[PDB]
Design a protein around this ligand. Structure first.
Ligand SMILES: Nc1nc2c(ncn2[C@@H]2O[C@H](COP(=O)(O)OP(=O)(O)OP(=O)(O)O)[C@@H](O)[C@H]2O)c(=O)[nH]1
Ligand SMILES: Nc1nc2c(ncn2[C@@H]2O[C@H](COP(=O)(O)OP(=O)(O)O)[C@@H](O)[C@H]2O)c(=O)[nH]1
Ligand SMILES: [Mg+2]
Lengths: 40, 145, 94, 439, 427
């Protein structure tokens, strides 16, 4: 990447506008005793 | 950028009053701007940005006044502070330990120096009955009262 | 507010619900609270120069001129300016 | 990570330091707010500002300088100036009443009250430094604070800190141009403790820089804003090597050893070149062979003295910008062939050179021109004997009738201290005569 | 930050001080009511020096008003800026002084000073750090000469380490308006030379000559005469209230200008004075101002400095100016007038430059002079004393209320001790 000032020098002089900002558990099953809320 | 070369000995308007700068930028500032007096004048001398042969003895009109140039040429020319800031400005404060006076600052209490100076700058810029409550508790409880 | 017609100067008293003389006998300025002008600039008469001859009377030895050069303009309250029901800025007091 | 501490006491020390930190913010591209800009990029290292600044984790830089004065009238300019958001709010220490151009009112009565707050800030600063190198104290001889508050601060700091070199940049009284009336008194009383706790005290004055401001710059009427911008560049040319890289860099410790031949002879003079305006720089060619012959002229020393009468003792050239070492070498051998420039016999090697790779800077709205290079001269010579001869001729003519004495006595100074300080300069004037004679 | 207490007693001292508080109120933009109305913010950072904040954004001065007569106290309330003062500061007796020194210092002035000094110590105790005292009086009266030395004696016995600004109007040879002026003058210098750090001497006949030569006033009344003293009054202490470039407070003038404990009587001055006509013809520069300082006709005392020598000169500049032209022009004037300045003191002249000039002018300057020529002011008073003391005239009005003949010989011996020092150092 490059700074904003470097992007200013590249459009007034070379006449190009290049701005690419390139970047770089489930619960166990129920057994069968009690309630499903109590065992959980 | 019109100016005078250093070492110039002529007169410049307001040259004797301006301080702390060289002759160059003092003269460069003074040339362009009039202020109290008149600007440098409109006609500025200073600071710049034939059917006859020679030997002819006849009369050519208004040729005795033109000079310094040859016979054919003269024939050719003969024929031709935080106080001034707004209240909404975040810079309206004084840093810690400022000796200088701030109006309406001695009357405030229980605040730090920046908050107190900001407030000072802004100011300078600008039951019912015991019997009724505890009686008839049976119908309307103490929470109801 | 007293206003002597012979002198056009104003003295002011007070009536307590007296503190005597509120403002002294002087020509009341009209526009704004005026700044104190530098001394020697408030002369009634203008003079080119005094007499170069060393023998001279101090009150009599002045040559007056025809040009009002450094004259400070001042407006003063008079009987024509103030009438019944007009605001007056008494040294800043409206 | 090579560090320095700059203390500014008195009015002259503080007011020059207002123009020193003028420069360092724009050398390294730091805004007055303390935040580096986001749009513009400058050429400057992350260790380049570490000599004179400190990086705070919010990305705001803070100076390493302590501002002390006994009178609040000058410090309050800085607190409400353009650099309010720059300094530490505790670093600016405020007194109550000044020294009144009295030595004993800054060393015995008022100067004892805040000396614990002054030294504790130096203790707080030095513990933050990773590696320390020295001190740069700014004051003046003739004042009551620059003589008073300098005297006790550097005598307690030498006790606390053992072998760190101290570099004092003090304003010498001029021979003719002088402001106060107690200048011959306040200058003698400082030097009774400079000789024991100051290793190198660079010295400038007011009349020589006035005349330099007239011939070279062509300024008809100079203020104090003009002088502080010129002294602000010499100090930025001495501490250039710790911030930038070059060919042969000079260390703050080493030129303490190249410039002090005897333990009592440590008073050099500063000189900067090429000091020129904007109309003459574009016309001339300012090469290496001529910016160093400008330094050796009798009219270009920044102290009102004649260097022809004395003989030089030890020199030190400090270059900057685009310079190659060979042009410096031929520019030195052409100087030793000159007959007016006289060196002592016992010191055949006297010159020393240092080269940096950064050109000088210019402040917007300034007076100095944009030049490719610069040279700073720091000359130790025996010509200051005549400078201190006339000042001791001021002392005895006033001490003969005991004028102005009782203002000193009324604060705590004994009368007997006046005689002992005069006998110190009695010996020091004989030292330049003892050193200067050729064996 | 530095706090100054102002006192005024006597008719000549009351009216000049009332003209003093009028100038500085406009300088800092204070309305006659006490409300701040100004243009620049630099006038407000140091406002605690002269003024005290009241509740509601109203300002009051630090002045103590004392007289033995109620006549002039009604006049100060009746002035153009008279409403600003504190009604708790108006302490006064009811019996007139009668132009008598003993009626202000021993008989009737001994009952009022208990409540006079109580108001003074109430104002100074509210201050955080006090600097000094400024008092206005006249040397020839019965109040200002009697009570002037009474109050400075009692203040210094309780504030030892301070500075005293005694602004005294001295008697005049031709403009003498009381027959007992030699009696009232010699009776106050016994306490002025002992208990005053610096005294500024003002006569009446040099102020008329300034009003007739430099200013060319046709009718120089008392309203314009006291304003001349008022400008030098407010010009000496500009470095304590306004920012500057070479600052110098009141004790700095104490060190530079007092070489001996009893040579401290200063001649004052003002420096941009001009007539009304030639405002457009005068070039306002530092070389024009410096010639206006050392003119023989521009100081405010009845002494010719050409008849003596100079010990120490200090001049406080104001406005935007350079310092080379200040430092060279106050070195050129010392070298050209080499005979006048003494040879046993080098660098007689002390300069000071501020940054805010007064309103209505681009720059200004205040001149202060210590000279040996002030011995002529004390010589004529001493020889006027002898011709009246020889025949014991006008003496029973003094000896009839406690004073004795033995006090008169001691005071005249002190003038002879004081005037001998200037002549001794001259050669
Ligand atoms: N070149 C230069 N000299 C200065 C400056 N400020 C003060 N001086 C010199 O300092 C000398 C006396 O010291 P001052 O600065 O006036 O006073 P001080 O040293 O602060 O001592 P105090 O007044 O007691 O606080 C004067 O003779 C001036 O020549 C300045 O900004 N630039
Ligand atoms: N310049 C000036 N002098 C004054 C004024 N009022 C009185 N004097 C002088 O004071 C002298 C007399 O002092 P006096 O009033 O008797 O002192 P007091 O009795 O203590 O009040 C006279 O010679 C006058 O010239 C004044 O308003 N301005
Ligand atoms: Mg100071």
């Amino acid at each position: 990447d490059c700074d904003p000032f470097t992007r200013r020098y590249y459009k007034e002089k070379f006449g190009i506008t290049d701005l690419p900002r390139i970047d770089v558990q489930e619960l166990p099953p129920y057994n069968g005793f009690g309630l499903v809320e109590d065992s959980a | 950028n019109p100016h005078y070369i250093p070492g110039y000995t002529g007169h410049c308007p307001l040259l004797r009053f301006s301080v702390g700068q060289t002759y160059g930028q003092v003269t460069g500032q003074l040339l362009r701007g009039p202020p109290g007096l008149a600007w440098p004048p409109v006609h500025r001398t200073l600071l710049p940005p034939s059917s006859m042969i020679p030997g002819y003895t006849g009369f050519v009109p208004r040729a005795q006044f033109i000079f310094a140039k040859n016979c054919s040429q003269v024939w050719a020319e003969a024929l031709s502070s935080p106080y001034s800031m707004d209240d909404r400005d975040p810079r309206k404060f004084f840093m810690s330990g400022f000796t200088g006076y701030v109006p309406c600052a001695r009357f405030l209490f229980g605040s730090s120096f920046p908050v107190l100076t900001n407030q000072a700058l802004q100011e300078f810029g600008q039951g019912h009955t015991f019997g009724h409550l505890t009686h008839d508790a049976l119908g309307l409880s103490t929470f109801q009262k | 507010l007293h206003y002597f017609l012979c002198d056009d100067t104003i003295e002011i008293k007070e009536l307590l619900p007296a503190l005597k003389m509120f403002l002294r006998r002087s020509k009341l300025p009209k526009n704004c609270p005026p700044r104190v002008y530098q001394p020697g600039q408030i002369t009634d008469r203008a003079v080119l120069n005094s007499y170069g001859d060393f023998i001279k009377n101090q009150a009599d030895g002045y040559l007056f001129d025809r040009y009002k050069l450094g004259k400070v303009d001042q407006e003063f309250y008079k009987d024509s300016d103030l009438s019944l029901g007009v605001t007056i800025n008494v040294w800043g007091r409206k | 990570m090579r560090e320095c501490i700059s203390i500014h006491v008195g009015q002259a020390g503080v007011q020059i330091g207002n123009a020193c930190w003028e420069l360092y913010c724009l050398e390294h591209g730091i805004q007055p707010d303390g935040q580096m800009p986001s749009d513009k990029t400058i050429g400057g290292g992350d260790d380049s500002f570490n000599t004179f600044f400190s990086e705070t984790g919010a990305g705001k830089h803070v100076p390493r300088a302590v501002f002390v004065d006994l009178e609040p009238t000058v410090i309050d300019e800085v607190r409400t100036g353009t650099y309010r958001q720059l300094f530490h709010p505790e670093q600016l220490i405020t007194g109550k009443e000044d020294a009144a151009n009295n030595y004993a009112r800054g060393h015995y009565t008022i100067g004892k009250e805040i000396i614990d707050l002054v030294l504790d800030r130096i203790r707080k600063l030095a513990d933050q430094c990773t590696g320390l190198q020295g001190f740069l104290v700014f004051h003046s001889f003739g004042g009551g604070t620059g003589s008073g508050f300098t005297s006790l601060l550097m005598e307690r700091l030498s006790v606390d800190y053992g072998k760190k070199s101290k570099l004092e940049f003090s304003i010498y009284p001029a021979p003719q141009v002088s402001t106060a009336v107690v200048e011959p008194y306040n200058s003698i009383l400082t030097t009774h403790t400079t000789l024991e706790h100051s290793d190198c005290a660079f010295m400038v004055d007011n009349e020589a820089i006035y005349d330099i401001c007239r011939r070279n710059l062509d300024i008809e009427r100079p203020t104090y804003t003009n002088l502080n911008r010129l002294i602000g560049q010499i100090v930025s040319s001495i501490t250039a090597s710790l911030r930038f890289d070059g060919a042969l860099n000079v260390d703050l410790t080493e030129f303490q050893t190249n410039l002090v031949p005897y333990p009592r002879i440590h008073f050099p003079l500063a000189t900067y070149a090429p000091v020129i305006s904007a109309e003459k720089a574009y016309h001339e060619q300012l090469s290496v062979a001529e910016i160093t012959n400008a330094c050796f002229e009798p009219a270009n020393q920044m102290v009102k003295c004649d260097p022809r009468h004395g003989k030089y003792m030890a020199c030190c050239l400090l270059y900057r910008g685009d310079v190659v070492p060979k042009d410096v070498n031929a520019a030195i051998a052409t100087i030793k062939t000159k007959r007016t420039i006289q060196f002592v016999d016992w010191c055949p090697t006297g010159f020393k050179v240092g080269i940096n790779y950064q050109p000088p800077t210019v402040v917007p709205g300034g007076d100095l021109a944009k030049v490719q290079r610069a040279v700073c001269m720091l000359s130790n010579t025996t010509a200051i004997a005549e400078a201190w001869a006339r000042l001791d001729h001021k002392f005895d003519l006033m001490y003969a009738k005991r004028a102005f004495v009782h203002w000193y006595v009324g604060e705590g100074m004994e009368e007997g201290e006046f005689s002992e300080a005069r006998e110190d300069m009695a010996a020091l004037e004989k030292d330049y005569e003892e050193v200067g004679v050729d064996s | 930050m530095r706090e100054i207490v102002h006192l005024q007693a006597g008719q000549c001292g009351n009216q000049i001080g009332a003209k003093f508080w009028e100038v500085i109120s406009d300088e800092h933009g204070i309305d006659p009511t006490g409300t701040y109305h100004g243009d620049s913010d630099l006038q407000l950072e140091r406002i605690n020096v002269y003024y005290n904040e009241a509740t509601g954004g109203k300002y009051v001065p630090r002045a103590v008003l004392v007289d033995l007569e109620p006549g002039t106290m009604d006049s100060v309330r009746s002035g153009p800026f008279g409403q600003i003062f504190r009604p708790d500061n108006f302490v006064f007796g009811q019996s007139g002084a009668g132009n008598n020194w003993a009626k202000g210092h021993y008989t009737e002035g001994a009952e009022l000073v208990d409540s006079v000094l109580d108001v003074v110590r109430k104002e100074a105790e509210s201050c955080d750090c006090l600097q000094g005292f400024q008092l206005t009086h006249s040397l020839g009266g019965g109040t200002g000469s009697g009570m002037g030395t009474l109050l400075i004696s009692k203040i210094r016995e309780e504030y030892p380490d301070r500075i005293m600004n005694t602004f005294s109007v001295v008697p005049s040879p031709k403009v003498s308006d009381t027959v007992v002026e030699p009696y009232n003058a010699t009776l106050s210098v016994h306490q002025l030379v002992e208990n005053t750090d610096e005294t500024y001497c003002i006569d009446n006949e040099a102020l008329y000559d300034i009003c007739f030569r430099t200013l060319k006033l046709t009718t120089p009344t008392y309203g314009d005469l006291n304003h001349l003293v008022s400008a030098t009054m407010s010009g000496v202490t500009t470095c304590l209230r306004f920012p500057g470039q070479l600052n110098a407070d009141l004790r700095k003038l104490a060190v530079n200008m007092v070489p001996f404990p009893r040579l401290h009587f200063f001649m004052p001055g003002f420096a941009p004075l001009t007539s009304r006509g030639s405002q457009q013809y005068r070039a306002l520069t530092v070389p024009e101002l410096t010639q206006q300082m050392f003119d023989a006709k521009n100081m405010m005392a009845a002494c010719d400095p050409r008849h003596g020598r100079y010990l120490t000169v200090a001049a406080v500049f104001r406005g935007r100016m350079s310092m080379k032209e200040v430092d060279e022009q106050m070195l050129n004037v010392q070298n050209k007038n080499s005979s006048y300045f003494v040879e046993w003191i080098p660098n007689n002249v002390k300069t000071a430059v501020c940054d805010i000039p007064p309103r209505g002018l681009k720059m200004s300057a205040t001149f202060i002079g210590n000279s040996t020529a002030i011995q002529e002011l004390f010589k004529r008073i001493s020889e006027q004393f002898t011709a009246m003391f020889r025949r014991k005239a006008f003496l029973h009005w003094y000896t009839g209320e406690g004073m004795d003949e033995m006090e008169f010989t001691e005071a005249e011996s002190n003038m002879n001790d004081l005037v001998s020092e200037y002549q001794q150092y001259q050669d």
